[PDB]
Each structure stands twice: as C-alpha cells, then as structure tokens.
Design an enzyme around this catalytic site. Structure first.
Site, PDB file in Angstrom:
ATOM      1  N   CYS A   4      61.254  31.594  44.304  1.00 43.52           N
ATOM      2  CA  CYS A   4      62.224  32.543  44.838  1.00 43.52           C
ATOM      3  C   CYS A   4      61.810  33.029  46.226  1.00 43.52           C
ATOM      4  CB  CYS A   4      62.380  33.733  43.889  1.00 43.52           C
ATOM      5  SG  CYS A   4      62.930  33.279  42.229  1.00 43.52           S
TER       6      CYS A   4
ATOM      7  N   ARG B 220      58.344  27.903  47.115  1.00 41.33           N
ATOM      8  CA  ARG B 220      58.384  28.997  46.153  1.00 41.33           C
ATOM      9  C   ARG B 220      59.565  28.896  45.197  1.00 41.33           C
ATOM     10  NH1 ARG B 220      55.709  33.495  47.329  1.00 41.33           N
ATOM     11  NH2 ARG B 220      55.979  33.799  45.072  1.00 41.33           N
TER      12      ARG B 220
ATOM     13  N   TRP C 240      64.272  29.840  42.100  1.00 41.08           N
ATOM     14  CA  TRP C 240      63.558  29.154  41.022  1.00 41.08           C
ATOM     15  C   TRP C 240      64.241  29.554  39.718  1.00 41.08           C
ATOM     16  CZ3 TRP C 240      57.584  29.771  39.697  1.00 41.08           C
ATOM     17  CH2 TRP C 240      57.296  28.958  38.594  1.00 41.08           C
TER      18      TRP C 240
ATOM     19  N   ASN D  18      64.726  38.908  44.617  1.00 41.15           N
ATOM     20  CA  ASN D  18      63.547  38.219  44.106  1.00 41.15           C
ATOM     21  C   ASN D  18      62.921  39.076  43.016  1.00 41.15           C
ATOM     22  OD1 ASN D  18      63.914  36.115  45.885  1.00 41.15           O
ATOM     23  ND2 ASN D  18      62.276  36.735  47.292  1.00 41.15           N
ATOM     24  N   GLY D  19      62.923  38.569  41.786  1.00 44.24           N
ATOM     25  CA  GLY D  19      62.326  39.281  40.672  1.00 44.24           C
ATOM     26  C   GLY D  19      63.231  39.360  39.461  1.00 44.24           C
TER      27      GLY D  19
ATOM     28  N   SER E  86      43.546  28.138  38.520  1.00 42.26           N
ATOM     29  CA  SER E  86      42.615  29.221  38.814  1.00 42.26           C
ATOM     30  C   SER E  86      41.748  29.544  37.607  1.00 42.26           C
ATOM     31  CB  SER E  86      43.379  30.461  39.274  1.00 42.26           C
ATOM     32  OG  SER E  86      43.918  30.267  40.570  1.00 42.26           O
TER      33      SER E  86
ATOM     34  N   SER F 103      43.196  34.187  41.803  1.00 40.60           N
ATOM     35  CA  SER F 103      44.618  34.004  42.075  1.00 40.60           C
ATOM     36  C   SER F 103      44.780  33.578  43.528  1.00 40.60           C
ATOM     37  CB  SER F 103      45.384  35.290  41.790  1.00 40.60           C
ATOM     38  OG  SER F 103      46.712  35.206  42.268  1.00 40.60           O
ATOM     39  N   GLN F 104      45.201  32.330  43.741  1.00 39.09           N
ATOM     40  CA  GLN F 104      45.472  31.856  45.095  1.00 39.09           C
ATOM     41  C   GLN F 104      46.554  32.697  45.759  1.00 39.09           C
ATOM     42  OE1 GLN F 104      47.196  30.331  48.388  1.00 39.09           O
ATOM     43  NE2 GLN F 104      48.383  30.066  46.502  1.00 39.09           N
ATOM     44  N   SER F 105      47.643  32.962  45.038  1.00 42.45           N
ATOM     45  CA  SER F 105      48.753  33.716  45.606  1.00 42.45           C
ATOM     46  C   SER F 105      48.488  35.214  45.606  1.00 42.45           C
ATOM     47  CB  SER F 105      50.035  33.424  44.829  1.00 42.45           C
ATOM     48  OG  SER F 105      49.892  33.803  43.470  1.00 42.45           O
TER      49      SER F 105
ATOM     50  N   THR G  48      50.459  36.364  40.890  1.00 37.65           N
ATOM     51  CA  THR G  48      50.769  35.898  39.543  1.00 37.65           C
ATOM     52  C   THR G  48      50.948  37.082  38.600  1.00 37.65           C
ATOM     53  OG1 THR G  48      49.473  33.893  39.947  1.00 37.65           O
ATOM     54  CG2 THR G  48      50.005  34.414  37.655  1.00 37.65           C
TER      55      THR G  48
ATOM     56  N   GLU H 127      41.377  20.257  34.585  1.00 41.99           N
ATOM     57  CA  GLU H 127      42.131  20.324  35.832  1.00 41.99           C
ATOM     58  C   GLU H 127      42.778  18.981  36.149  1.00 41.99           C
ATOM     59  OE1 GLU H 127      43.854  21.387  39.432  1.00 41.99           O
ATOM     60  OE2 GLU H 127      43.304  22.465  37.601  1.00 41.99           O
TER      61      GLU H 127
ATOM     62  N   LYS I 137      46.759  18.287  36.701  1.00 39.51           N
ATOM     63  CA  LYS I 137      47.380  17.699  37.886  1.00 39.51           C
ATOM     64  C   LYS I 137      48.274  16.523  37.513  1.00 39.51           C
ATOM     65  CE  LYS I 137      46.092  20.269  41.230  1.00 39.51           C
ATOM     66  NZ  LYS I 137      46.325  21.372  40.254  1.00 39.51           N
TER      67      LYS I 137
ATOM     68  N   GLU J 192      51.439  17.696  36.114  1.00 38.82           N
ATOM     69  CA  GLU J 192      52.343  18.504  36.924  1.00 38.82           C
ATOM     70  C   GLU J 192      53.158  17.654  37.893  1.00 38.82           C
ATOM     71  OE1 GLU J 192      50.342  21.437  39.253  1.00 38.82           O
ATOM     72  OE2 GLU J 192      52.098  22.748  39.408  1.00 38.82           O
TER      73      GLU J 192
ATOM     74  N   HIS K  65      35.183  14.878  16.159  1.00 36.57           N
ATOM     75  CA  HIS K  65      35.784  15.801  15.205  1.00 36.57           C
ATOM     76  C   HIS K  65      37.293  15.612  15.065  1.00 36.57           C
ATOM     77  CE1 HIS K  65      31.944  17.830  14.928  1.00 36.57           C
ATOM     78  NE2 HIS K  65      31.923  17.996  16.238  1.00 36.57           N
TER      79      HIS K  65
ATOM     80  N   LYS L   6      55.759  27.049  42.881  1.00 38.59           N
ATOM     81  CA  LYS L   6      54.436  27.606  43.126  1.00 38.59           C
ATOM     82  C   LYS L   6      54.449  29.117  42.926  1.00 38.59           C
ATOM     83  CE  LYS L   6      50.508  27.210  46.292  1.00 38.59           C
ATOM     84  NZ  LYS L   6      49.741  26.390  45.308  1.00 38.59           N
TER      85      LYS L   6
HETATM   86  O1  LIG Z   1      40.492  17.929  10.693  1.00 41.97           O
HETATM   87  C1  LIG Z   1      39.527  18.275  11.315  1.00 41.97           C
HETATM   88  C2  LIG Z   1      38.141  17.880  10.779  1.00 41.97           C
HETATM   89  O2  LIG Z   1      38.045  18.326   9.425  1.00 41.97           O
HETATM   90  C3  LIG Z   1      36.997  18.409  11.687  1.00 41.97           C
HETATM   91  O3  LIG Z   1      37.467  18.776  12.981  1.00 41.97           O
HETATM   92  C4  LIG Z   1      36.217  19.581  11.089  1.00 41.97           C
HETATM   93  O4  LIG Z   1      36.905  20.801  11.334  1.00 41.97           O
HETATM   94  C5  LIG Z   1      34.803  19.696  11.658  1.00 41.97           C
HETATM   95  O5  LIG Z   1      34.647  18.800  12.758  1.00 41.97           O
HETATM   96  C6  LIG Z   1      33.739  19.399  10.627  1.00 41.97           C
HETATM   97  O6  LIG Z   1      32.739  20.427  10.735  1.00 41.97           O
HETATM   98  P1  LIG Z   1      32.590  21.443   9.517  1.00 41.97           P
HETATM   99  O7  LIG Z   1      32.331  20.687   8.253  1.00 41.97           O
HETATM  100  O8  LIG Z   1      31.435  22.345   9.940  1.00 41.97           O
HETATM  101  O9  LIG Z   1      33.876  22.268   9.470  1.00 41.97           O
HETATM  102  O1  LIG Z   2      48.390  23.054  39.898  1.00 44.58           O
HETATM  103  C1  LIG Z   2      48.815  23.996  39.300  1.00 44.58           C
HETATM  104  C2  LIG Z   2      48.965  25.341  40.028  1.00 44.58           C
HETATM  105  O2  LIG Z   2      47.959  25.460  41.035  1.00 44.58           O
HETATM  106  C3  LIG Z   2      48.931  26.468  38.972  1.00 44.58           C
HETATM  107  O3  LIG Z   2      48.035  26.138  37.918  1.00 44.58           O
HETATM  108  C4  LIG Z   2      48.552  27.832  39.552  1.00 44.58           C
HETATM  109  O4  LIG Z   2      47.138  27.893  39.704  1.00 44.58           O
HETATM  110  C5  LIG Z   2      49.006  28.996  38.673  1.00 44.58           C
HETATM  111  O5  LIG Z   2      50.355  28.780  38.263  1.00 44.58           O
HETATM  112  C6  LIG Z   2      48.898  30.338  39.367  1.00 44.58           C
HETATM  113  O6  LIG Z   2      47.624  30.421  40.038  1.00 44.58           O
HETATM  114  P1  LIG Z   2      47.474  31.375  41.333  1.00 44.58           P
HETATM  115  O7  LIG Z   2      47.565  32.800  40.815  1.00 44.58           O
HETATM  116  O8  LIG Z   2      46.053  31.142  41.838  1.00 44.58           O
HETATM  117  O9  LIG Z   2      48.516  31.080  42.352  1.00 44.58           O
END
Ligand SMILES: O=C[C@H](O)[C@@H](O)[C@H](O)[C@H](O)COP(=O)(O)O
Ligand SMILES: O=C[C@H](O)[C@@H](O)[C@H](O)[C@H](O)COP(=O)(O)O
Ligand SMILES: CC(=O)N[C@H]1[C@@H](OP(=O)(O)OP(=O)(O)OC[C@H]2O[C@@H](n3ccc(=O)[nH]c3=O)[C@H](O)[C@@H]2O)O[C@H](CO)[C@@H](O)[C@@H]1O
Ligand SMILES: CC(=O)N[C@H]1[C@@H](OP(=O)(O)OP(=O)(O)OC[C@H]2O[C@@H](n3ccc(=O)[nH]c3=O)[C@H](O)[C@@H]2O)O[C@H](CO)[C@@H](O)[C@@H]1O
Ligand SMILES: N[C@@H](CCC(=O)O)C(=O)O
Ligand SMILES: [Mg+2]
Ligand SMILES: [Mg+2]
Lengths: 652, 653
Positions: free
Chosen positions: A1, A32, A95, A122-123, A348, A392-394, A397, A525, A529, A532, A548, A647
């Site tokens: 916006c 924006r 937006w 805006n808002g 962030s 926060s880059q901006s 947020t 990250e 990316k 996005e 697991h 953004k």
């Molecule tokens: O479905 C998920 C699995 O059952 C597995 O993720 C489990 O939660 C643990 O990895 C085993 O560890 P514990 O026996 O200590 O829970």
């Molecule tokens: O690539 C993704 C964007 O960079 C996004 O993740 C952003 O970081 C947040 O939506 C707000 O972050 P800011 O408060 O730093 O702008």
C-alpha cells in the site's frame, strides 16, 4: 500500500505532466503493493484551468502500475493538453490482502457519484462496520467492500452537516479521524476545496515533500491547536505527499515527516500542521537497479558493499575494536540483564536463528528466538530484566511492532535492529542499531538478512569485550569479518555454476534443504526464498531430525540440498548425508572448497570458501539466494514482484 | 535387534516346548523390523538330558521368524520329545549392520565349528576391526562379516587362556566387555557351563524375567563386586528365567522383571541369579503393569489403526488415579517428592525429538499460562549443537515414548551435568531416560507398536497439561481456569469418540488428496503443533510432501505457494485466535486457494463458506489440539492404505 500525490501551485503543468508524475510516484512505491492502482485528478476540458477544479476523474484498474499507466493513456475524453497553474492529483497502489483487486476496491475511493470527496488510505479502520451502518441510515449508498469507503462517505457527512458555510477542510478531516479507529494515512481531495490537500496520519507513515526555487519561510512548522511553510516573495511551490521517501527523493530532498494526529493542510499553497522540514540522507542512486535486470539481483550482488556499510565506523581491525554508537548509553545495562529475546517475522526471524548460537557463546545468557505472531498468541512471559531485540528491515511490521509495545509494557529493555531510520520500531525502542544496508526494494530480503546477521555478531563482540578468555575468539571472528566482503565476491563469482544447477531443478515440484547448527537458519531462509519467488515447494529440514520421520520422504526422485561445512557438526552432517544416500537420494551439497572428501563422493557440489564457523552462514545462504533467483527466471517469474504478497507487512 | 532367552531350571520341558517358547518370544520382537533370525539350544537325541549338554545346536536363517519355525520342524534327525530338567535356549532377530542378510551372518554367532560358545547381540562393536585382527593373529578363523562374531571368538580366547580350571563364566564375560567398544546387549551360552546364562549390556536395554511357584529369596538383588546375595526359589529349585531386550517377549510368562544397567553382568549359576560389577546398591525385582493384550492388533488390521482408535482408552489410562473431577485435584505420583522444588525453579525447558517435540509445542502456551514461568521448547539435536546455557534453577523436561532416543538422552545428561532438575515424560518403564531422570511421569499409554507416534503424542499432551494443573493448584485466581480444563479432560474421551465417528468424512478427504503430491497445513496458536504433527505424520506414513505453516507467517513469504492447484488444510477453532485464522483464510481464498478447513462443530459461519470442512466438537482451548490432530492421524492412515502402503512397515531406519 503506497500513497503519492502531486500538488503544483502556480507551476504550470499540463495534464500529461501531472499524470506522468502520479504514475512515476507509484512506481517508486510499487514494491509496497502491486495488486491494483488508481489516480484521482481534475476533469473537464476547459482552457481556463479555473473552470475545471469542480470535476473529479478517477482512473483505477486491476494489475500493477503498468496496467494503470496504460489505462490512463489512450483515453478519448481526457485531453492531455490543458495547462493547469494550480492542481492536485492523488494516486495509490494497493496490496489486496482480502477480496478481489477490482477497480471498485482500489483507491482513491469516493463519497458520491459526483466525486465530491476522494481519499487514498493506507491501513485498516477497525470500526468501518459501525461507520457503514451509521452512514447507510443517513442516506449514503455504498458500492465497494473496502474500509476506505467509510472514510469518503464520512467526510461528506461532516460537510453536509457543517455549522458555518466556510468550514475549513481541516475541520472536516479532524471530525472524521475522531470517528475512525485503527491506523490510517489519508490524503483527501474535494471539489469544494479546489487545490487544497489534507494529510493526516495515525500509526502509518506520511511525509510531505516540498520543492521551490524560492526561499522558504521557515524550517520548523509550528503545530497548532509566521506560521505556514511557503515560498517567500513568490508563489511557485510543488508539494509531494507520499508514504515513503523513495517517491520524493527523485524530485526533492526536503520533506516534513508528520507524526500521529498531525493534520497537515496545503491551503493557497501554504503548508500548515494542525492538531521540522529536514533533509533526506538518501541518494537517488540507492533506489536504482543500475546495470542489473532486477532490484533483487543488484541487492544480492551488492552484499559485499552493504556488509561493509554495516561495519563502517563500528569495526576497527587495526586494534580489533567494536563500537556500536546506538548502544553506547545502554551496553552496560544490557549486561546486567539475565535473558535475550529475539522477536521478528520471516527472514528477519531467520537472522535471529542464524546468530542464536554465537550470542549464547559470547554473552553466556539464554537466548530465545520467537516468531512475532506466535509470541503474541501465547502471551509469552516477559520480565523487567529481559533484553528484547526486534529485527525489522522496514521497522513497520505489525506483529513485530506489537511485540515491542508488549515488552515495553512489561518493563523490558527493548533494542531495535532496523534498516529504516524514523520507523516505528526504531523510534519506540529504547536503543538499537541501524544496519545501514541501504534501501531494499526487492520484496524478498537479501542484503537485509546478511546485514542483520553482521549487526547481531558485532553486538555479541561488544558483550564479551571484557573477557580475557574470549579475546582470542573475538580476534578470530573479527578477522573473519575483515575477509568476509571478498569471500562474498568469491561466492558471487559462482553465479554461472548456480544457474546451471537451477536448470536441473526448475521443473521439480519440491526440494528439501537440510542443515544443522549454524546452518539451520540457512536452510530455513533458503527454503523461504525458493517459496517466495519461484513458487516451488521448498522446505527446510533440521538435519538431526531426518531420522525421526521426514527421511521417509526421500528417494531417487526427491530433490535434496544439503549444507555440510567445516565446523563441529561436520561428522553429524556426513552421517545425515549417508542417510539421504541410503534412501537413494542424489543431493546437491553446499560444502567447503577444501572439503575434498565431500567433493569426491558427490557429483553436484557448490564449493564456498571457508570462514569462521559463526560467519559461514552468510556465505552458505548466498548460493540459495542466487538459486531462487535463477529458478524464478527459468519458470518465467518476476523476482521483484512475487505473487500473493508484497514487501513489509504493516497490517495484521 | 531382538534378544530372547529361556532358561528352565528344574522345570521339565520338552525340546518342542523349549523351541516353541523361543519362537513365540521372537514374534513379540518382530515389530522392530528385522531381516534374519536364529536359535540356539542343546542338541543330541539321547534319552535323558545332561549327556546332551555338550552338543550346542544352531538353527539360523534369513527371512521371517515364520520361516525359522518352519525350518525348526524340518529337522529329521532332531527328536523333539526329549525332556530337559535344566536347559537354556537363546534366540535372536537381526537388523543387518556389519554384513549382509545371510545364514552365516545370522545369530547366534559361534566361537568355533563345535559351538563351545554362542552369543546373541543387539548393537555395534565399534572397535571390532582391531579385535578381529587380534584374534586372527592368535589363530582364530572367522566365517562371517559380523562384528558380533568377534564377541564369540573373544570369549573363547579368554577361556583358552584362563588361569585356573574353574574360572567363572562371569569372569570370562567381564574380560570380554573390557575389550569391547560401543553398544551391546549380550546373552552367552557355553557347553563348558551347562545350564548357565550370562547377560550383560552397555548402551542397549536388557532385562530378565523370573517365574516360580515358590517363594523367591528377595525382591532386591544386591550387586557383587570384585546365600543372601542372589535370587532363587527358597525351599525348592524350580524356577524359570527370561532374558529379553524388550518386555513384550516376557509379559505373557511373567510380570516380575529385573532391569539391567550399563556394565552389569547377570549370571544364572545352579539356578540362582546374581549380578556382578567391577566398580549397598542393588537391582530391584519390580512388577510391570503391561499385559499381552496391549501388544496385539486384536480385530484391527494394523497397529496404527488400533492405536489411533483406542485413544479414548489410552487418554483415560493416562489420567487414571491422577485426576479427581469432584474436588478438582491433580496428583501425579511420580512428582510427589519433587513438585515443591520444581515450583522454586525459574524456567522450564522441554527437550525432545520429532513428535515428542511437537507435544511440547502443543502445551507450551498452557504451561506458560499456569506456571507463569518462561518455557523453552528445544529440539534435542540442536540443543546439543549450540551448547545451550543451562543453570541450576532450570527444570528440564525430556519427552520420549521409548526413553532411549540418543539425542534426548544425551541432552538429559547434558543438563544433569549442569545441576538442573531433570523430569522425564516417558512411556517405557526401565528406559534410560526414565531411570536417569530425577523424577518424571509414566504417561501410561500402553506400549506403542505402530511405526508412528499416535497415542503417545496425545498421552504426552494430557500428561503435560496435568503437570500444568499441579503447578497452579495454590492460586485462587486460577481455580476457575483449572476447573474448565479439568471438565474438558472429563469430556475428552467422549469427544475423541465423536471425532473418530467422522472417519468416513476423512476417507472422502483421503480420496481428494490421493493423487496429490503436496499439501499445506496452516494453523496458529494452540494449533501450530497440530499443523507440524499432521505434516510429519503425512510425510512419515504417506510419503507425500506435507508441510506445516504457521498461519501468521503467510504474508511474510509462504503465501506465494497458494493457487488453484495447491491442496491446503486450515485449522480454525473458536479460541482467541479465531479472527486471525479467519484473516488467514481470506488471504488464501483471495489467491485462488480452496482449502479444507478443520473447524468446530458449531462454526456455522465457516462451514457455509467452505466446501469441505471437518467439524470436530468444541473443547477448552488448551485441549482442542488433541481433537484437531486426530483427523490428520486418520488422513495419513487412509492415504497410505489407498496407495498400497503397509502402515506397520517402517520405510526409514
Ligand atoms: O511419528 C513420529 C515418530 O514416532 C518420531 O518422530 C518420534 O516422535 C521420536 O522421534 C522418537 O523418540 P521418542 O521415542 O523419544 O519419542
Ligand atoms: O523474503 C521474505 C521477506 O524478507 C519477509 O520474510 C520479511 O522479512 C518479513 O515479511 C518482514 O520483515 P521486516 O520487518 O524485516 O521487513
Ligand atoms: C541516525 C543517525 O544519525 N546515525 C548516526 C550515528 O550512527 P550510530 O551507529 O552511532 O547510531 P544508529 O544510527 O545505529 O542509531 C541512532 C540512534 O537511534 C537509536 N536507534 C537506532 C535503531 C533502532 O532500531 N532503535 C533505536 O533506538 C540508536 O540507539 C541511536 O541512539 O553516528 C554516526 C557517526 O559515528 C553517524 O554516521 C550516523 O549518521
Ligand atoms: C513404574 C511404577 O511402578 N509405577 C507405579 C506408580 O505409578 P506413579 O503414577 O505413582 O509414578 P510413575 O509410574 O509415573 O513413576 C514411577 C517412578 O519413576 C519415576 N520416573 C518415571 C518416569 C520418568 O520419565 N522419569 C522418572 O524418574 C517417578 O518419579 C516415580 O518415582 O504407582 C502406581 C500406584 O499408584 C502404580 O500403578 C505404578 O505401577
Ligand atoms: N551388529 C550386529 C547385530 C545388529 C543388531 O541386530 O542389533 C550385526 O550386524 O550382525
Ligand atoms: Mg529509539
Ligand atoms: Mg528415575
């Protein structure tokens, strides 16, 4: 916006010069929001510009600003040759997080079919439902489903029920904001007040640029409850309402950063605030692609420079000193606290995950990293001796800003890690550090991440500058920072090799990115990316968690990227790599150049140079930044305008 | 992988009865997964035993225990009718590690071509390379690529170089384990020690079951370092011993078990059981609440289906004796001697892996609300990598169904080294994490035989909630909140039945996603954990790319995946995050998303504006996570069944 308006008072501009200035301002703000756009200017085809300020024309269309720039032109009724000596035009790109991005839901809204009051907003108005019911009963018909229309239908209700025949436009707007809840940044325009603009704000940015070849009367407009900013001797003046400085730097570097509940007004070409005029510390070059096809590409390849700017005047390698001026008057009190909390969203938040381990090492304090939205849902306990960081880059947020005010209410010391001076988070934090990464235009954060990374590292270096046992470790890190810019250049030199890899993955639907330790944040990250801008279903998986369950998803057909670096988890990572292989996986391994073992036993390897274990995350994420860029180009997508979002999430 | 030995001492058993007992014991261990199996017993067809105590016979094979049993009855020369007054039989199921599934590589491993010594092994001998090279230099020829074979050859080396003609079987094994490195659970048998058994462990579980119609000499075996000192029937000799690596193979014969600990060397000599060490303390004979019925599928076609649909029962078993809905009191017996010290600590740290970690995420908010202490939830593998700071006034919880997960166990020892109070949330009595914790709660969900955690997750959920109710039992301001939560637990078993009665609706959804390759599961607040656990289950069981996405993060990037083709599942319950979830729903639909919504039964607003909706009943906000995850358990189950997968077969290791 984004908001942008152009008021040329006694500066002759033809109807093509004003429309090309409104569109040129939205393009500066398109990042924006780019789901729809619109403009609001004077209609009528009378040579005498004075007989045209009673007719308002709205041109709104779905799509980016380029869809609007083509809707403005090739119109058979708007003669683009009328000379206007005084005119006001408002524009806005939207937006659309809710509903359809139709021309009706775009701004500027209108108060009636004759366009007596048009507003760009805006808002969000948190009580537009109660305002819509009250206005429907008094005889006002609604057309759109947005909350901005309840602001247009209400300024006309205060005008149709005014006490005197000449109630200032400020009075009509002041009565409206008294009935509006939530945040808003408004710019009105009415036929009854020809050429007069009103700019009020509350929880949303809004500045007023000024350009004039004549001397200005003052350099500090006094708020009201020898008074107005206007050119001396002559009347020529050009104003630039805008919710950002990028749309104004191109024309001038003299703006007025309003504050909450400041009702600015330009009457007869004189700006008055009801209820500073500083120079901008920005150059036009900083918001230009230069030789790059996209802002994202520029901002990735400029990371050697932005990393240096982050450390400028803060890191001295001759004596291994770290001084963050923004924390000079607080570092001692920060050290008396007992816990660190990092709060942010998205990339962030990943910067906090990326530096959590080193912060725990050098401060020896507990470090909790929280997603802002979940931090608020749970009403997380916060105490007087907590130090809460807000990344926060901006600096705008919504959730991050709400967490800030949440922690302030509980007596915590609040620290800001921002890239926007004068932003809400920067202002309302007790102290903080401006990462000095430069304006970030691309929707996806690239240099902001690495600059937040470096900023949190420098902070850690300060927190341990009095520990004898940690002196050696500090030198290691600081030497790594000295070498980091050139090592980033070495990573960027592999762009061609990354692009080749992208051609082997652009067709896939999913990709699993795996890492642990310092590179948990890297795979989160990187997975973000690729989500996005390429729209591939990429997911980051903690390497230690494969056994697991998630490992069952791996086979010869599932794309996998692993990060295996030369730190204390190398053996554990090699074990995870063996697991992926036993399941028939054929992974791409981001590894160290000297890692001959990995390079021999893996066909596809991206070999990054070695660095300090707590800095390697900066070098390992850049290949994933590049990979997402190339994947997006192969799939035919715009890396600067990804779908479904924009953004800075400044509204919840 | 599976160990079972049966020692009948003055309890006459025929060779047939002995072999049936061994085979039956392995059937209780098959669910762990295996590729080979074998048995070891006294050979010889001479009428009357003892003369047959010098001819150890082996029957090993590659494949399932069924094939082994078929082989056992395919031996012409073997007479199955000989009666044995004293006899030891050992048996094993193998998960190939050092060697290929083959007969020779199957257990038991012999010390020579005459089977003077045989051993069954669960684990890995890290230094088996050096050991194998040493034994070969002394003149011992190997026939298999197993690291286990080095154990069999080494115990014979110790015997061939014994100082006296009457060195004990224990002394020999003590000298063997002093050369072994890594993890191992062992059971030894030898012609030179007829009728005797030696069992020892290090980093691998090993227990002993005992049965006798006579009084036993003690219920606490004292340790003997290097007669009131050992266990035995008092007035008569008859007794039966059961060595096993898992209680499931013992509980049908006896519920009196002794849990061995690292470096213990348990020996049965003349029908009497003693436990020796090289380093008063002793090992207890305790009673297990386990029952054979709890490890059987019953009428269900899979253990996964059983353990999902029996969750109304397992939830009740978790609460039994611990909740009182009249006076609204919660009493976790395992915390009686520590609850007051826990309340003097300043921070809670929950440490776990996988679904057990999700259980912490699912109860973090209520723990914060009712304890008012900071609550950190950590993945064990990352907790260790970062060297997380831990302090003396931290209380660290360790969630583990098995009680043996490596990273969770190492985190437990990490925190113990730093003086933190350690608390276990486990479902395996005698497990490493259960023993080594200062205190804890056995969630009493019953044995979990299915591949994936179903009832263990919900029983951990309920257990942590019950603990939260203990922490605030002295706060007037919270009495009402506690009643609300406890009346929710009272209603919880019936609400689960209501959810399970929607199984038909879940199958229709499984059909919609049959051909799909991805699905996004979105939620926030109390249901963040629901999305993560549902996404893991569908990954683990169905092998499709299901991902959990925190709803509040959509606009920060991940929302770019939504379009008309991406399947989405959103969780929108009627708690304080309701309006925010509706916001996320509008964000998805705006981008052509057409999500399936798990919502409350009486959420008429969302039911009408969404095509497919799974409508669960309402409960207290901090318990809805149990009801909203079950439809995702069933969805994973039905998708795998539609795609021809065996839900009881593990795809990963
Ligand atoms: O479905 C998920 C699995 O059952 C597995 O993720 C489990 O939660 C643990 O990895 C085993 O560890 P514990 O026996 O200590 O829970
Ligand atoms: O690539 C993704 C964007 O960079 C996004 O993740 C952003 O970081 C947040 O939506 C707000 O972050 P800011 O408060 O730093 O702008
Ligand atoms: C904005 C400004 O004029 N910065 C100057 C400052 O930089 P310097 O690096 O010293 O300080 P910063 O620019 O990082 O921050 C400026 C002030 O705003 C506060 N703050 C910043 C970010 C945040 O998120 N929250 C917050 O409260 C800081 O505590 C600090 O008091 O001295 C340098 C000279 O060495 C100059 O080059 C910089 O122009
Ligand atoms: C194992 C056992 O015999 N439990 C008995 C105990 O249950 P009860 O519910 O009282 O206690 P638990 O079964 O939960 O735990 C038993 C003991 O093991 C400890 N512990 C348990 C789990 C863990 O992870 N870490 C840990 O240290 C407990 O602190 C406790 O000292 O009394 C009940 C009678 O009222 C019996 O029905 C149970 O058979
Ligand atoms: N390491 C032994 C035993 C493995 C086991 O079944 O635990 C082998 O591979 O033969
Ligand atoms: Mg400030
Ligand atoms: Mg214990």
């Amino acid at each position: 916006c984004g908001i942008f308006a152009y008021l040329n008072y006694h500066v002759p501009r033809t109807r093509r010069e004003i429309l090309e200035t409104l569109i040129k301002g939205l393009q500066r703000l398109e990042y924006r929001g780019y789901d729809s756009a619109g403009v609001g200017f004077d209609g009528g085809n009378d040579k005498d510009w004075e007989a045209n300020a009673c007719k308002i024309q709205l041109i709104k269309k779905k799509g980016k600003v380029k869809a609007l720039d083509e809707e403005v032109h090739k119109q058979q009724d708007m003669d683009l040759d009328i000379e206007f000596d005084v005119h006001l035009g408002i524009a806005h790109t939207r937006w659309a997080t809710h509903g359809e991005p139709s021309p009706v839901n775009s701004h500027p809204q209108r108060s009636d079919k004759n366009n007596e009051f048009i507003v760009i907003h805006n808002g969000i108005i948190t009580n537009y439902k109660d305002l819509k019911k009250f206005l429907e009963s008094k005889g006002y018909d609604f057309e759109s489903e947005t909350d901005t229309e309840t602001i247009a239908k209400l300024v006309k209700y205060m005008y149709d029920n005014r006490e005197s025949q000449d109630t200032s436009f400020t009075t009509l707007v002041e009565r409206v904001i008294q009935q509006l809840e939530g945040a808003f940044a408004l710019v009105f325009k009415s036929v009854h007040f020809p050429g007069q603009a009103v700019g009020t704000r509350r929880g949303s940015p809004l500045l007023i640029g000024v350009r004039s070849e004549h001397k200005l009367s003052t350099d500090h407009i006094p708020i009201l409850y020898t008074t107005c900013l206007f050119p001396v001797e002559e009347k020529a003046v050009e104003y630039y309402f805008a919710s950002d400085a990028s749309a104004v730097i191109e024309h001038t570097n003299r703006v007025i950063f309003l504050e909450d509940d400041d009702v600015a007004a330009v009457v007869d070409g004189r700006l008055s605030i009801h209820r500073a005029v500083q120079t901008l510390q920005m150059e036009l070059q900083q918001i230009m692609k230069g030789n790059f096809s996209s802002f994202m590409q520029k901002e990735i390849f400029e990371q050697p420079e932005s990393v240096v700017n982050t450390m400028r005047g803060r890191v001295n390698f001759d004596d291994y000193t770290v001084n963050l001026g923004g924390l000079k008057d607080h570092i001692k009190e920060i050290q008396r606290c007992r816990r660190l909390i990092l709060i942010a969203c998205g990339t962030s938040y990943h910067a906090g995950v990326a530096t959590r381990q080193v912060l725990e090492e050098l401060t020896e304090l507990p470090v909790m990293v929280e997603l802002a939205s979940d931090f608020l849902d749970r009403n997380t306990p916060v105490f007087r001796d907590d130090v809460c960081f807000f990344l926060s880059q901006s600096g705008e947020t919504a959730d991050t800003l709400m967490g800030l005010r949440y922690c302030k209410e509980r007596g915590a010391l609040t620290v800001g890690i921002t890239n926007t001076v004068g932003s809400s988070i920067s202002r309302e934090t007790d102290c903080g550090v401006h990462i000095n990464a430069g304006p970030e235009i691309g929707v996806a954060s690239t240099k902001a991440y690495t600059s937040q990374f470096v900023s949190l590292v420098m902070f850690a270096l300060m927190m341990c500058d009095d520990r004898i046992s940690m002196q050696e470790r500090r030198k290691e890190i600081m030497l790594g920072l000295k070498r980091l810019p050139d090592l980033i250049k070495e990573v960027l030199s592999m762009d061609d090799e990354i692009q080749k890899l992208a051609t082997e993955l652009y067709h896939q639907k999913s990709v699993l990115i795996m890492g642990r330790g310092y590179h948990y944040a890297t795979c989160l990250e990187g997975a973000l990316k690729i989500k996005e801008i390429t729209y591939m279903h990429s997911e980051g998986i903690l390497a230690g968690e494969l056994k697991h369950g998630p490992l069952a998803l791996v086979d010869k057909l599932m794309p996998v990227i692993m990060i295996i670096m030369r730190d204390h988890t190398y053996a554990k990572c090699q074990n995870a790599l063996q697991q992926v292989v036993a399941r028939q996986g054929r992974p791409v391994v981001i590894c160290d150049k000297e890692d001959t073992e990995t390079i021999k036993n893996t066909k596809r390897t991206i070999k990054v140079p070695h660095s300090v274990d707590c800095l390697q995350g900066i070098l390992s994420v850049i290949p994933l930044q590049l990979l997402a860029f190339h994947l997006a180009v192969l799939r035919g997508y715009d890396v600067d305008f990804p779908r479904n979002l924009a953004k800075s999430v400044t509204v919840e």
